[PDB]
Subunit: 327 residues, 3 copies
C-alpha cells in the first residue's frame, strides 16, 4: 500500500498474512510438499524517488516471517530477507541496481541462492527496455554476480555473468536467458557433480492477454542444480538437467482463475545413479479472488515421481489450501 | 495506526517501544520474574478489506523484537512472530480464519504453544456472534488444532478440538471454554505426566463497566501444563492442575488505573512430588495513562511461593517499572 | 517518512535499502573492511505524542536486516535491533528514557555493547538542554547503565554511570564525555586486560556551519576497548588506549560532499605485546546526494597499519562503493 508520497518520494509498505495448510499422507517425508501448517507472512517496502525528470532512484526490501514455529527456540526457523537492493533508472539509458535480487535466468519462467535461477546476493543488474527507446518491445539485461563463499556448498558461488534478451509483441513474448559462473572450492569438494564452472540457460514462450495466460519454458543446467541422495545422505549438484515447465490459466470475470501446470526436471549422469527425475508432477488448482486484497485457493499436486526414484525423491501427492490477505 | 484506507481496504500498522526493567534480589534465578533490563518492541499489521456489504477479508501479523540483547551472536534471542493469520467474516454467519492465533480457552481470562491456552500454530477458528444474529449477547467459537510435531515436547501437539460459549449482558459476562487434544510420541516419552490426551477447561465471570473491571476465572488441566523439576532437571507436564485467577481494577478519569490481582496454580499427583504450587502470588500495580499513545507503570509481585517448593519454583519478589510508547 | 499524524500523535516509519560492495585484496581476512557484498536494509519507527503543551512521550525502534545471507541456515546472520526505547520530555526540565540506546560518550564523536561508546541495553538516560532553559547552548546528560551479564565477555557489563557536558555556540561546539562501570566476573576471567572497573572519556571540538564540517576528538580508555590476538586466538580488553579522530567535509550545492578523515587508536601495556595500534587509517571518500532519498558513494580506506602489527590487525586497503535509497 502506498503509505507515503510527498516531495517526489513515495514509499509502498506492502505485505501479507497467509493461512496455509498442506495435506499429504504419512509424515510428509515422502510426499511432494510436506504436510501440515505452512502459515506465514511477508513485510516489505518499495521506495522510489524522482531525482529529476529522467532520473529515478529506488530501493526495495522484503522479509519472510514464518507463522508455524513455536515462540520457543525454533521461533526463527525459515525467516529471511528475500530482497534488498537500491538502484537508479535513467531516462532511456536503462537501469542499474545492486543487492540481493533475482537472477536473470528467472527472467524467463511464467531455487534460492542457486546462481542465476532464483534470488541471490551480490548481483549488479543492468536492464534496458525498448532498446534505448528505439525498438518498442525489445529488452535486455546483463548481470554480474559477485563470488559468495558461504559455509555451505549449496549456498555458495563464484564470480559469473549472465544476460537475457526478450521480445514482447501484443500478448506474445519470447525469452532467452543464459548464465555461467565459477564454482567455489567447497562446491567442488562435493561428492556429486564435476566441473569448475556452472551454467544455466532456459528459453520461453508466453501468450499473455484476454484473460488467458499460457506459457512454456525449456532449459538446461550443468553442475548448477542441487540434488541429494536420500539413501547415502550424499549431496552435490547434478551434472546435467533438462527442465520443462508448462502453464495454462484462465481468469473468469467473477474471480475464478483455474490453473493447469506440468513440470519435469530430470538429472543426467548423476555420479552413481545415471538418469533420475528430480521433479515430475502435474498441478491442478483454482484461485478465487474476492478482490485485490483477499483470496483463497486449493492447489493439487499430482506427483508423477515413482516410488523407485533412485535419489529417494518423494512420490506422494499434496493438496494445498490457503487463504490470503494482503496490502 | 491506520496508515492506509482506500478502495475498501484499510491497513493498520501498529506497534510499541517499551522501556522495561525488573528489580529482584540475587541473580533473579530464584525470583518471580527474573531481574534486569526487559526492554522490547512490537511491530504488526492488521488488514481488513470489504469484499462486499456482508463479506469481509482480513489478516494480521505481529512480531516481537527483544530490546535487551547485544548486537552480537545473541542478537536474535527472544524474537518471534506472535500472530499470523488470514480469515473471512460473512454477514451474520460468523467468521473463519487459519494461522498462528489464540487458543479458544484463552477466550476466558480477563503459555504459548501450549494447546489451547495461549498462542499456537495451525488453528482453524470459527466464531459466531449473537447466535447467527438471533440472540444478542450469545457467542461461541469452535477450534481445530492441527498436530504440531516440534523438536521439543514442550512445543509440540497432537490433533484436537476446542470450543467456548460466552454470554454477555450489560457489563456482565460469563464464559466456558474447553479443549482436548492428542499428545505427541515425544510428549509421551517425557518423565513427568501420564496420558495420551490433554485437556484444558476454565470458566469465567466478569463485570466490565463504570470504570470498573473485576474478573474471576477457575479452571483445570490434565497433562497440559508444563512443569520442570529444577533439582532433577526433569521436565514434562503436570498430571493435574487447579487454577484460580482474580482481578480488580478501577480507572480514574485522570489516567490512574490501580490493579489488584491474585493467581494460584497448583499441580497434583506430580510423579514423585505429589501436590506442588506452580504459581502463587498477589500483584499490586498502577498504570498511568498520559494518553492513548503514552503510559508508565509499576507492578509489584508479592510472591507467595515458599522457599521449600519441591519443584524449585522461585520464591522472590519482583518489581516491574516500565514506560510505554505505542502507535 | 511521516506515515501518521492525527490526534497529537505522529509516527515516522523510516528505513533504507543499501546496495553495498567492498573491494579488498585476498580473502579480505587481512584487509581493513573485509571483502564482498555488504548489502543490507533498515526498518524503524519513531513515535511522538503530545500529552499536553509541555509533556511529550516518545519511543523508537530500529532493526538491521542483512542483505547478503542465503535464504538458508545463515539467513539470520547479522540481524539485530539497534535501538528500542521509550521516554518522556517535559517542558524545560529535560528528558528521560530507558531501553537500548546510545552511550553518552558517543555524545562526542562527529563499538556496540561496549559500555558507553556505542549502543547498549538497559540505559536510563537523562538529558537537559539550554540549562533548564536558562543558558542557551549549554546541555548535559547523565546516564545509568544496568549490569548486563551476557554469555560473552565482550558483550557483558557491570553497573555504571556516565555523563557529558557540551556547549554550542554558532557553528562551534565543545564536548566532554566520561563514563565508568564495573566489569563482570567473566570480563575479569579474560586473558587480556586487568581491572575491576572500566572507564571511557573523550572530548571534542567541532565547527558545523557554511557547508563546512570539521571535527576533532581525543579520548582514552581503560579495560574497555575490545582486542583479540589473532595469533594466540586470545581475547580480552586493552589495558589502555589513546584515540584520535579527525574529520573534514564540505558540501557542494550540487550534491557532492567530499570527505577526509583520519583515525588512530593505539593500545598500551597489552599483556604480552606492549604498545600496539588497534586502528590506523586515512579515509578519502565522496558522497553524492541526488536528493534527500537517494545517494551513492565511494569510500577509500588508506590503511596505515603495518604488516608486522603484533595483534595481527589487518593492513590491507578497502574501497567501499554503495548506492543508497531511503525513506
Ligand atoms: C554498486 C556495487 C556493484 C559491485 C559489483 C561487483 C561485481 C563483482 O564481480 C562480478 C563478476 O561477474
Ligand atoms: C485453511 C486451512 C484449514 C486447515 C485446517 C486443518 C485442521 C487439521 O486437523 C484438525 C484436528 O482437529
Ligand atoms: C524505567 C526504568 C529505569 C531503570 C534504571 C535502572 C538502573 C540500574 O542501575 C544503574 C547503575 O548505574
Amino acid at each position: 500500500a502506498e503509505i507515503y508520497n510527498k516531495d517526489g518520494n513515495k514509499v509502498d509498505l506492502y505485505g501479507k498474512a497467509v493461512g496455509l495448510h498442506y495435506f499429504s499422507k504419512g509424515n510428509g517425508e515422502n510426499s511432494y510438499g510436506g504436510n501440515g501448517d505452512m502459515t506465514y507472512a511477508r513485510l516489505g517496502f518499495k521506495g522510489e524517488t524522482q531525482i529529476n525528470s529522467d532520473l529515478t532512484g529506488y530501493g526495495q526490501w522484503e522479509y519472510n516471517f514464518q507463522g508455524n514455529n513455536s515462540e520457543g527456540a525454533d521461533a526463527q526457523t525459515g525467516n529471511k530477507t528475500r530482497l534488498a537492493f537500491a538502484g537508479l533508472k535513467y531516462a532511456d539509458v536503462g537501469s542499474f541496481d545492486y543487492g540481493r535480487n533475482y537472477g536473470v535466468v528467472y527472467d524467463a519462467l511464467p531455487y534460492s541462492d542457486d546462481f542465476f535461477v532464483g534470488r541471490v546476493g551480490g548481483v549488479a543488474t543492468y536492464r534496458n527496455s525498448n532498446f534505448f527507446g528505439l525498438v518498442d518491445g525489445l529488452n535486455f539485461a546483463v548481470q554480474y554476480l559477485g563470488k559468495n563463499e558461504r559455509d555451505t556448498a549449496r549456498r555458495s558461488n563464484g564470480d559469473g555473468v549472465g544476460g537475457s534478451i526478450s521480445y514482447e509483441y501484443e500478448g506474445f513474448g519470447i525469452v532467452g536467458a543464459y548464465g555461467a559462473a565459477d564454482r567455489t572450492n567447497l562446491q567442488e569438494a562435493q561428492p556429486l557433480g564435476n566441473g569448475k564452472k556452472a551454467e544455466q540457460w532456459a528459453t520461453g514462450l508466453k501468450y499473455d492477454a484476454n484473460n488467458i495466460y499460457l506459457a512454456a519454458n525449456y532449459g538446461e543446467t550443468r553442475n548448477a542444480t542441487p540434488i541429494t541422495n536420500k539413501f547415502t545422505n550424499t549431496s552435490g549438484f547434478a551434472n546435467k538437467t533438462q527442465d520443462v515447465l508448462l502453464v495454462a490459466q484462465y481468469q473468469f470475470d467473477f474471480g475464478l482463475r483455474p490453473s493447469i501446470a506440468y513440470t519435469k526436471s530430470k538429472a543426467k549422469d548423476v555420479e552413481g545413479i545415471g538418469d533420475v527425475d528430480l521433479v515430475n508432477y502435474f498441478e491442478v488448482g483454482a484461485t478465487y479472488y474476492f478482490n485485490k486484497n483477499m483470496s483463497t485457493y486449493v492447489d493439487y499436486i499430482i506427483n508423477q515421481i515413482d516410488s523407485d526414484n533412485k535419489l529417494g525423491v518423494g512420490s506422494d501427492d499434496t493438496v494445498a489450501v490457503g487463504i490470503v490477505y494482503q496490502f
